[PDB]
Ligand SMILES: O=C1CCC(=O)N(O)C/C=C\CCNC(=O)CCC(=O)N(O)CCCCCNC(=O)CCC(=O)N(O)CCCCCN1
């Protein structure tokens with residue numbers, strides 16, 4: 001029995017996708033949690049998946065694999081491999097098992113779930129989650145905007161090693177919830193320089209120019225942000241002086257999947273409400 005394999009923008013099939021795969025290898029942390037949400041049995045997952053404190057609990061049995069670990073992936077005997085479209089070795093992966101390749105941003109973070117529901121005939125489960133999400137986020141939006149005001153601007157940022165990044169509405173780090181689910185505006189330069197591009201690496205000195213009312217900042221640990229937070233440049237930013245900086249744990253906040261997002265939603269709601 002094969003998947004109906006619908007034509008979906010950004011989804012490429014290699015081989016005959018099983019309708020009911022029993023041994024799924026996920027090589028893209030974007031998708032792992034969607035597969036889990038739809039009760040797919042994962043036997044391989046990524047390093048990020050293992051470090052995500054929400055998701056990791058659900059995939060303890062899975063082996064940590066990278067896309068280059070062809071031998072380990074083969075040994076796992078998958079009947080389905082799920083990958084991002086930018087992976088360079090799709091040919092060799094497809095020799096191991098059927099592959100679903102997904103190109104980020106062709107479908108939104110919600111569509112991806114209903115898309116997998118169609119691929120695997122789990123539409124009911126997908127629809128129910130999406131319904132509750134849309135109802136909950138609509139209510140939560142009203143609550144948070146009652147504190148911030150409706151026109152408050154948010155910037156999504158992330159700290160990685162010595163680097164500083166801004167993110168748009170659809171590159172994780174809380175952007176889906178802040179920009180899409182809560183319909184928060186962003187500063188002008190964020191909308192014109194970051195949103196379409198997905199992300200932007202930036203030098204410290206111009207950071208003030210991209211921050212308005214609030215900032216959500218992702219990092220994997222406390223030490224990464226240390227120097228920045230103590231800098232005069234940083235302390236000069238109005239949002240910082242007003243205590244409108246929401247620091248979040250990247251280990252879960254990198255992610256976009258339903259399981260991660262459930263946790264991120266409560267965290268962001270609570271953080272914004274307590275900013276008052
Ligand atoms: O899908 C998302 C949000 C968007 C995202 O980050 N992606 O990687 C998916 C879309 C791009 C796939 C193509 N891969 C790359 O461009 C490699 C670099 C990359 O992953 N990026 O996100 C580019 C900007 C961040 C670079 C610094 N690295 C990290 O922050 C590690 C977390 C990091 O960026 N990762 O991707 C690892 C955890 C990802 C969890 C799921 N999150």
Ligand SMILES: [Fe+3]
Pocket residue numbers: none
């Ligand atoms: Fe990434």
